[PDB]
Write a protein that binds this ligand. Structure first.
Ligand code: MG
Ligand code: ZN
Lengths: 114, 49, 1042, 55, 92, 17, 617
């Protein structure tokens, strides 16, 4: 299970080969589940779905593709991550252990779960 | 794999049944490869340079 | 045949004084201004030296420097008028090397380490592409200057890469040098290979060669033939910007087969052409060419204080010459004298920086004479001109077959420094070029010629010979016994007939260092535990009453005579005066010699450097007889530990996992007790409000805490100081009579002892006080430490341990004669660590105690028999049993084991155990620390780190991960905010704990606010927001800094 | 005794189905205990009480 | 005297780091792309190429290349993804 | 090791409040 | 319940930087612009008025005290002075207020210039080398093609080419009108202001539709950046700085030991000096090359401030070492995130050498008195105040300092039931930190239970451990209920036991339970039960490894046995006595067992009896 968790953190993404009516531009890495749900609702209304190719990330390339810029800036390549976040206007909603640890809140795991 | 065999007796080399074949590299490096596996005798002596 | 052990440090300073400073003075002697009117000549062959001021001991006790003054004669010559104003100018202050191989800088003993670097010369290498053929490159490396890289391409092209710039075909370089086609065609042996490059890149002429060279070296500027010529002259031909060195010239001549003179130290046409020819031949496999190994000790050099000093002096002299030229041309009148022309500030600064702030000049290791001796014989691969920790890899930190007899394969550090610092072997020496050599005896027709003198030989020399180890056995006279003999031929181990052996090593300990040569029964130990024991032998502490080992190795009397702490009589006469501080010997027919002994001094590591006499008054004394001894020597020889009764068996859990159980005799018999002296310092400064005064009028203190002050505010010599006791009383003029504030110096928590010295230094007394200080008071406090729970004990074979229990002698196991043991060691640690030698020494030590004898066993003693150590130990034990008369001493059924009883119940253990006499050492180092609340950092407001400032323990991110895996959220949040940097939650938590209430919720720690401010200061508009609750409202930015 | 507290702790960890939730309950209980007692140590008394209430 | 050329036959932290970082192993084994048969095809110049015949009869022409990628494939039952040579497969 | 990590901060020690 | 929900980061506009630094005064004067590169006065050791440590901008040096000394004491709160206009408040505001520096000429933010993706270059669709040359005054750029025929928009012009263009434009017959060129960051700002994001987005989308290959990928990256700027509603020319922020002075402290100064002071001084010199050159109408060189210097100084050594040469200090810029603070293992946010030095912590305590229990540790009296000082003070006659904190502290006998009794009754966490320096897994109960021991070393050593990977040859003490009730409850050592039995990585006896314990058990044919005194004797056999061994009647028989009724596992009864004997009754190799069972004919005798060693009897006693009790 310990290795399975890591492998699922490495093999859970997809590259949007050619988007349809989706808001997914080509070249973006997105979770398979999210892409599947978007495609489902898109052909539910009767639009043109998007194509994709599964990808293998790695232990460092997947840690830099998180949705929180605070976790990524504190891991590696601080200036690149911070520049990208500033350009994209990203917002971090503090839903991870490294970010309640950085700010100083109760971690969302364990006795601080709720 | 490869391994270099080096003599311990100083003297004159003498082939026995060894048939070298010259394979010329594109730069002209003539590498002698033996087609027939034989003996390389060393006849002992004093070699002067 | 062991010569002076610390000779790598003397020969290099004797060399610097004799011909190292002269060469650097003369190399810059003729200074000329730009108008060519004045010339300064430095007759550097006549530099005199002024006798050192103060003294060695005075410098040590004053906290000054032991040095001399350098004066060189100079002559200022006017190019026209011809007036020559001869004079002697002050050049600088040169710290002098003492008789022990060390320097005294700012009242502290320092040693200059030896650096192992790559030797200058030309080195060839072959690299293989992923799919391509072999391509060869050559690197030409000088002693000082720019490197010259040659490279062969995949198509047969020759490229040169001056410095780190882009490559350029060799034709440009050869034509720019001023060579016609015929000479470079004749000197090369296979000219068609270079003709291919000539055809592909076009035959450059000299003018266009220099044009292209300038264009490639310095792009963006208009090319100029003269510009290129000058660039080349400054790059590879300028005597003051390119130096091959004597070793560089020697290596170039040896490798390329040239014949150039030894005096020329710059690159010449012949050199580059030869190097290119060798590269071509290596490409074409001519037969007499071979790529180079950079780890070979024949391609590596050792630099010591002489060379490193020379280089620093060279830099200072360059700066001095610049200053002289500036203060020579500006002058419109010839009213200048050589005294007013030279400024010794740059040279003094360079020497001071080298001796005080360099990373090659190191604070001396002075725990015991062994550590001191091996600190002067240390070789480092790091420093200004060597390696770096992040760049050194697996290849560099290993043992190279060329280290045999030159660098110890055992003694190294453990951790980040493993393989990067080494130790010189026992018989190894460094020659005048800088290569390590090692001695051998010649073998003629299988006969070892010990009548002839040892032939020393370097790593490259002993590659074509078949060299036998020092453990080969010879019969009467010299013939080698046996039919097959192990030899080394071309860095490989083989076996040969003993009629084809060329050389034999001098001693079986020629391969190891001095610390590793002091381990008896070393060949029965693993190499890792041998490393541990050798390293731990240099952390032993001099004890109150030292004692020689019983199973010594034979190098103990030699490892103590070089530290310069043992006094021997040079005279064959009588002793007339003995005292605790003075010895006097009257020659049988001659003058009186007098010696003064150091008493309870202090080393760099707070140990004691005592010296005691051995002889009595009116004693007959022979030459070379020990007269006085050091703090770690008994009678001539090293003594780092004590011989104690040991048994190998488990106790009731107190031996568990390297823990040590000892007896209480080691406490009340003053075994393993030592003297440690510490130094405390107080400074009287001058504040803007006013100066600081040392006086006993301390505020908020009663007369019960001013008992031991000397009516001047400073404690008295011979007073017992406990924790928090005032040492020096000081008052500061605070601004807010009742105005003075107390910042008097007190003993740190956990420290006590006697005051043994109170030295005072004030500017009035003629002392060099700091810039802003007005009184420096130094206090020395001494204490006696006994063995106790938590101390580290060690043996010579790598067995370390921490004492966990100290049993009363009626609880320790005892012998069949009633003697309780002194230490019980777990045998579970012996077979898994393969340090069996400890089980041999004990047994021999047992015999040594019983026979009133002392055994000198040398390592690798099995060249005489099949099992020499076991047979000698068994025979000695049997002889002790027969001499003593007690049959329980030695048993034939279990040789090394005898019956042992239980002190608690009186019942014998089920089986006999191994007992003996073991030589154990007490290691240095004060580690217990605790904190509740103290000082905080400036930016982050987090607790400081360090025992000396009430520091906290770091809770790294691995510990955060561990707490996250437990599910802990409140412990983690309390650690991260309330206990580190929640600037307001710390006080609330402390107040709640003191009052007994509940700890309130934390806020935002200060490091997060610091980070947000820094990110805003990086032109990032990062902010924290609170989401809007209702629909038609905007999110509101939250102000953390409030 | 210490052993008794250890057995009671293990007893409460089981039958709770959430070690975190029962640690939070023990913390709360001990807090209330000390608060309405300042007017043995809180966490200890809390565990004793909760064990004696599990019947 | 002479350089003998012969044959021979027979992991720690670097392998785990390479696997977990999804790096391309230097000595990457040759991987098939479709089921087929495995013709070793020992050519005159020893141009050993694993030509596989598809379900319809389409060749693939996998070149073994140098001597280091030793062949272990003679199953004649290969399927998509099946390795052919010695060494670590490339997961990308 | 840097100098800036050995300098205390100006303030009132939690203990002295 | 929480102050803030999310952290948002955006591109800083010059208006925002000015807002960060500009604060108004009651007199109407606005402050927040650092104009002089002066830190502190050499004689009065007092900050200057318009420098890097100014009190009118950053805050008073001393809390509730004015710069000139007109106002002192708390009484004057919120009273900005008149002689010097400093706000009499707490000095803590010196680590929150920022202030700004206004630049004579615009500069480029090096992060958006020299990055792995060059956002300025990507937006401008220009190679990075051209942008760098324009920024650092090595080439001109055609801001407007105007009327020339061979000049294109955003084309690089060399100095000679620009001189030729100048000759063409100043010819009496030239119809050339409206040509504009620029050099420096001002040209980049003009180009960034020219970009119309909506039209560029539409054009790029249309071109991407009819595209493929690397061209498609590059246009995709441009479209992504443009769409990000459109969504963020941020103007791209904000990547070119007109004003810069100044970090609060307490974050770049200038303390007195000598004066120890942060490298940020030197970097800011370089920026201010070059900016002031540029303003002077622009005021006296200096030659154009001198002004351009000063602008290049200002760009380099701001570059070195933001990130030292990223673009050009590295600015060394007094010694030949790089100065630590703003970027060097928040990155690396020594950066802010990894040194102060993800891991901190904490209070109420100690460290000491560890020795083995064999008589301790698995849930207990041996703590020296010297460490404990310091770790639990506030609790000792509280119990001295409450349960004794101590009046104030000072009296309790002096009593602790003098080592009163009552102190140790109070500490002993304080630490009982108070869990303490022990950690070893390499914390590889969650068992590297475990909670114990302290027991006061005399010494300098921490006594550790031998059964937790494999969990910590600790041996007693010099290893040290760190001790932490939880403070709140929740923390103590969590330590006792989750991190207690007596509850960590199985390995969280494999589920296997981790508190198993090892080394000497295994050897002792093996020796006890082994078989020794040499010593079998008293072999063959029968015993009523396990206690009888143990008592017989204790006296010495039977040797430790003797083969005796004991009447044990229960499940027996004997290695080297046989499932087939060795001998079956039926007596003169319905009772059969099957004799196995290690058992003798009497069974009723077609019935149940009546007795069972096990052939065993008194050591095995002792081992099994110990296990049974531990389980039953
Ligand atoms: Mg250890
Ligand atoms: Zn004022």
């Amino acid at each position: 299970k310990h290795i399975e968790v890591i492998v699922r953190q490495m093999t859970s993404k997809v590259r949007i080969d050619d988007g349809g009516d989706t808001i997914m531009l080509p070249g973006e890495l997105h979770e398979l589940r999210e892409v599947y749900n978007s495609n489902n609702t898109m052909a539910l209304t009767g639009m043109a779905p998007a194509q994709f190719t599964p990808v293998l990330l790695g232990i460092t390339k997947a840690s830099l593709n998180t949705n929180s810029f605070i976790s990524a800036a504190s891991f590696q390549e601080t200036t690149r991550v911070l520049t990208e976040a500033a350009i994209e206007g990203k917002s971090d909603w503090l839903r991870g252990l490294k970010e309640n640890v950085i700010i100083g809140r109760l971690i969302p795991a364990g006795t601080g779960f709720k | 794999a490869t391994k270099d065999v080096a003599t311990d007796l100083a003297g004159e080399i003498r082939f026995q049944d060894i048939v070298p074949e010259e394979k010329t590299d594109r730069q002209g490096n003539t590498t002698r490869i033996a087609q027939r596996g034989g003996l390389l005798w060393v006849l002992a002596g004093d070699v002067y340079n | 045949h062991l010569p002076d052990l610390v000779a790598i440090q003397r020969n290099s300073f004797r060399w610097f004084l004799e011909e190292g400073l002269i060469e650097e003075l003369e190399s810059f002697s003729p200074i000329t201004d730009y108008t060519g009117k004045l010339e300064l000549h430095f007759l550097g062959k006549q530099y005199k030296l002024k006798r050192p001021k103060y003294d060695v001991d005075e410098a040590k006790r004053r906290d000054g420097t032991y040095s001399v003054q350098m004066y060189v004669p100079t002559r200022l010559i006017n190019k026209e008028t011809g007036e020559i104003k001869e004079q002697e100018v002050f050049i600088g202050d040169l710290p002098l090397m003492t008789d022990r191989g060390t320097f005294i800088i700012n009242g502290a003993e320092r040693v200059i380490v030896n650096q192992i670097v790559r030797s200058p010369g030309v080195y060839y290498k072959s690299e293989r592409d992923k799919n391509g053929r072999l391509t060869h490159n050559a690197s030409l490396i000088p002693n000082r200057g720019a490197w010259l890289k040659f490279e062969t391409d995949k198509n047969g092209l020759v490229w040169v890469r001056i410095d780190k710039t882009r490559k350029l075909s060799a034709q440009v370089l050869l034509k720019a040098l001023g060579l016609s086609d015929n000479e470079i065609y004749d000197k090369l042996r296979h000219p068609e290979y270079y003709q291919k490059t000539i055809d592909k890149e076009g035959q450059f002429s000299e003018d266009e060669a220099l044009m292209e060279l300038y264009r490639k070296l310095r792009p963006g500027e208009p090319p100029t033939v003269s510009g290129g010529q000058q660039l080349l002259e400054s790059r590879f031909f300028d005597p003051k910007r390119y130096d091959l060195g004597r070793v560089g010239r020697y290596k170039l001549n040896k490798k390329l087969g040239l014949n150039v003179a030894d005096t020329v130290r710059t690159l010449t046409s012949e050199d580059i052409l030869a190097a290119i020819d060798y590269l071509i031949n290596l490409e074409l496999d001519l037969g007499g060419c071979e790529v180079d190994d950079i780890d070979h000790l024949g391609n590596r050099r050792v630099r010591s204080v002489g060379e490193l000093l020379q280089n620093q002096v060279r830099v200072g002299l360059n700066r001095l010459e610049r200053i002289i030229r500036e203060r020579m041309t500006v002058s419109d009148s010839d009213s200048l004298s050589p005294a007013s022309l030279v400024n010794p500030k740059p040279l003094v600064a360079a020497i001071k920086e080298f001796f005080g702030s360099s990373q090659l000049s190191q604070f001396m290791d002075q725990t015991n004479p062994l550590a001191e001796l091996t600190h002067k014989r240390r070789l480092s691969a790091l420093g200004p001109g060597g390696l770096t920790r992040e760049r050194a890899g697996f290849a560099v930190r290993d043992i190279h077959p060329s280290h045999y007899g030159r660098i110890c394969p055992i003694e190294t550090p453990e951790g980040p420094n493993a393989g990067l610092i080494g130790s010189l072997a026992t018989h190894a020496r460094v020659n005048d070029y800088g290569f390590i050599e090692t001695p051998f005896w010649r073998v003629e027709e299988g006969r070892v010629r010990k009548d002839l003198a040892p032939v020393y030989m370097t790593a490259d020399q002993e590659d074509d010979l078949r060299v036998a180890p020092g453990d080969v056995a010879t019969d009467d006279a010299g013939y080698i016994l046996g039919t097959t003999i192990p030899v080394r031929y071309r860095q490989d181990f083989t076996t040969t007939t003993p009629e084809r052996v060329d050389y034999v090593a001098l001693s079986p300990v020629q391969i190891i260092s001095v610390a590793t040569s002091l381990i008896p029964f070393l060949e029965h130990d693993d190499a890792n535990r041998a490393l541990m024991g050798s390293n731990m032998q240099r952390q032993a502490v001099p004890l109150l009453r030292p004692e020689r080992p019983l199973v010594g190795t034979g190098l103990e009397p030699q490892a103590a005579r070089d530290s310069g702490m043992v006094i021997t009589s040079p005279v064959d006469g009588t002793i007339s005066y003995v005292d605790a501080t003075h010895i006097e010997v009257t020659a049988d027919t001659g003058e009186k010699y007098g010696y003064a002994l150091q008493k309870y001094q202090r080393s760099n590591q707070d140990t004691c450097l005592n010296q005691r006499p051995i002889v009595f008054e009116g004693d007959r004394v022979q030459r070379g007889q020990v007269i006085a001894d050091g703090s770690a020597t008994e009678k001539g020889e090293l003594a780092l530990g004590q011989n104690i009764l040991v048994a190998y068996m488990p106790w009731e859990g107190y031996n568990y996992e390297d823990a040590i159980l000892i007896s209480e005799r080691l406490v009340y018999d003053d075994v393993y007790t030592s003297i440690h002296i510490e130094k405390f310092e107080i400074e009287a400064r001058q504040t803007k409000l006013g100066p600081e005064e040392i006086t006993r009028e301390i505020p908020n203190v009663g007369e019960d805490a001013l008992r031991q002050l000397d009516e001047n505010g400073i404690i008295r010599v011979g007073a017992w100081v406990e924790s928090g006791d005032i040492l020096v009383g000081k008052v500061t003029p605070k601004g807010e009579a009742r105005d003075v504030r107390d910042n008097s110096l007190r003993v740190p928590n956990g420290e006590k002892g006697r005051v043994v010295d109170v030295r005072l230094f004030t500017r009035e007394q003629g002392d060099e006080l700091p810039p802003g200080a007005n009184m420096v008071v130094r206090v020395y406090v001494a204490q006696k430490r006994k063995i106790q729970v938590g101390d580290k004990m060690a043996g010579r074979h790598g067995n370390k341990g921490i004492i966990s229990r100290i049993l009363p002698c009626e609880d320790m196991p005892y012998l069949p004669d009633g003697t309780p043991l002194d230490i019980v060691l777990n045998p579970l640690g012996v077979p898994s660590r393969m340090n069996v030698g400890q089980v041999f020494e004990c047994m021999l030590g047992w015999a040594g105690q019983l026979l009133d004898a002392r055994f000198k066993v040398t390592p690798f003693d099995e060249m005489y028999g099949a099992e020499a150590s076991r047979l000698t130990v068994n025979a000695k034990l049997s002889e002790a049993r027969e001499q003593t008369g007690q049959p329980w001493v030695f048993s034939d059924d279990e040789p090394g084991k005898i019956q042992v009883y239980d002190g608690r119940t009186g019942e014998p253990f089920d089986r006999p155990v191994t007992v003996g006499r073991a030589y154990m050492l007490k290691l240095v180092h004060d580690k217990i620390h605790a904190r509740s609340t103290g000082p905080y950092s400036l930016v982050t407001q987090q607790p400081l780190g360090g025992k000396a400032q009430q520091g906290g323990q770091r809770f790294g991110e691995m510990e955060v991960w561990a707490l996250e895996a437990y599910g802990a959220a409140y412990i983690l949040q309390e650690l991260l905010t309330v206990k580190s940097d929640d600037m307001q939650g710390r006080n609330e938590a402390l107040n709640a704990i003191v009052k007994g209430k509940a700890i309130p919720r934390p806020g935002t720690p200060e490091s997060f606010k610091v980070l947000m401010r820094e990110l805003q200061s990086l032109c990032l508009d990062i902010a924290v927001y609170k989401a809007s609750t209702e629909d038609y409202e905007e999110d509101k930015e939250v102000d953390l800094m409030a | 005794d210490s052993q008794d507290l250890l057995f009671k702790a293990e007893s409460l960890i089981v039958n709770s189905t959430n070690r975190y939730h029962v640690t939070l309950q023990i913390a709360r209980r001990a807090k209330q205990a000390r608060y309405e007692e300042m007017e043995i140590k809180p966490v200890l008394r809390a565990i004793l009480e909760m064990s004696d209430e599990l019947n | 005297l002479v350089l003998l050329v012969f044959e021979r036959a027979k992991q720690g932290l670097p392998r785990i780091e390479e696997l977990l970082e999804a790096r391309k192993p230097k000595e990457a084994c040759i991987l098939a792309r479709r089921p087929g048969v495995a013709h070793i095809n020992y050519s005159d110049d020893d141009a050993i190429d694993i030509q596989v015949i598809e379900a319809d009869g389409t060749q693939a022409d996998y070149p073994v290349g140098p001597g280091q990628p030793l062949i272990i494939s003679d199953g004649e039952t290969v399927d998509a993804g099946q390795a052919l040579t010695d060494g670590p497969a490339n997961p990308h | 090791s840097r100098l800036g990590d050995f300098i205390e901060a100006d303030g009132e020690t939690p203990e002295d409040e | 319940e929480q102050r803030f929900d999310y952290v948002k980061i955006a591109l800083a506009s010059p208006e925002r930087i000015r807002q960060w630094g500009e604060r108004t005064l009651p007199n109407g004067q606005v402050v927040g612009e650092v104009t002089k590169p002066e830190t502190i006065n050499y004689r009065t050791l007092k900050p200057e008025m318009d420098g890097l440590f100014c009190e009118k901008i950053f805050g008073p040096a001393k809390d509730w005290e004015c710069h000139c000394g007109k106002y002192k004491r708390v009484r004057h709160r919120g009273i900005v002075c008149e002689r010097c206009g400093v706000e009499v408040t707490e000095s803590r505001v010196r680590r929150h207020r920022m202030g700004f520096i206004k630049l004579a000429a615009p500069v480029a933010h090096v992060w958006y210039l020299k990055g792995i993706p060059s956002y300025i270059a990507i937006l401008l669709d220009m190679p990075l080398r051209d942008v760098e040359q324009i920024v650092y005054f090595n080439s001109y750029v055609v801001l407007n093609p105007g009327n020339h025929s061979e000049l294109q928009y955003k084309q690089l012009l060399n100095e000679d080419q620009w001189m030729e263009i100048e000759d063409q434009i100043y010819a009496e017959e030239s119809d050339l009108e409206g040509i504009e060129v620029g050099i420096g960051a001002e040209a980049l700002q003009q180009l960034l202001q020219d970009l119309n994001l909506n039209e560029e987005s539409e054009k790029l989308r249309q071109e991407i539709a009819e595209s493929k290959g690397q061209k498609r990928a590059k246009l995709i990256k441009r479209l992504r950046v443009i769409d990000n700027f459109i969504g963020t509603e941020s103007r791209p020319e904000w990547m070119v700085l007109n004003v810069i922020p100044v970090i609060p002075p307490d974050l770049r402290p200038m303390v007195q030991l000598r004066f120890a100064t942060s490298d940020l002071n030197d970097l800011y001084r370089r920026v201010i000096n070059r900016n002031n010199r540029l303003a002077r050159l622009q005021e006296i109408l200096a030659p154009e090359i001198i002004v351009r060189n000063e602008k290049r210097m200002l760009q380099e100084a701001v570059d070195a401030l933001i990130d030292n050594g990223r673009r050009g040469r590295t600015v060394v200090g007094a010694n030949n070492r790089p100065l630590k810029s703003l970027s060097d603070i928040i990155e690396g293992k020594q950066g802010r995130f990894r040194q102060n946010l993800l891991g901190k030095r904490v209070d109420y912590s100690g460290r000491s050498v560890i020795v083995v305590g064999p008589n301790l229990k698995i849930h207990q540790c041996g703590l020296p008195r010297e460490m404990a009296i310091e770790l639990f000082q506030p609790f000792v003070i509280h119990r001295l105040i409450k349960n004794h006659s101590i009046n104030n904190i000072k009296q309790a502290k002096k009593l602790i300092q003098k080592n009163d006998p009552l102190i140790w009794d109070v500490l002993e009754e304080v630490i009982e039931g108070h869990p303490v966490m022990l950690n070893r320096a390499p914390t590889l897994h969650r068992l590297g930190i475990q909670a114990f109960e302290p027991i006061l021991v005399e010494g300098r070393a921490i006594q550790l239970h031998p059964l937790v050593c494999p969990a910590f990977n600790a041996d007693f040859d010099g290893d040290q451990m760190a001790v932490h003490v939880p403070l709140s009730i929740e923390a103590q409850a969590e330590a006792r209920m989750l991190m207690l050592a007596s509850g960590n039995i199985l390995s969280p990585a494999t589920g296997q036991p981790i508190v198993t006896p090892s080394q000497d314990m295994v050897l002792g058990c093996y020796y006890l339970t082994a078989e020794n044919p040499g010593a079998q005194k008293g072999a063959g004797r029968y015993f009523a039960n396990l206690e009888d056999a143990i008592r017989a061994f204790e006296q010495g009647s039977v040797d430790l490894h003797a083969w005796v028989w004991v009447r044990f009724d229960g499940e027996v596992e004997s290695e080297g046995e046989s499932d087939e009864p060795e001998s079956v004997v039926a007596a003169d009754d319905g009772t059969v006595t099957k004799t196995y190799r290690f058992r003798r069972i009497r069974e009723t004919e077609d019935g149940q067992r009546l007795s069972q005798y096990v052939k065993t060693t008194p050591g095995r009897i002792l081992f099994n009896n110990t296990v049974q006693t531990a389980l039953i009790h």
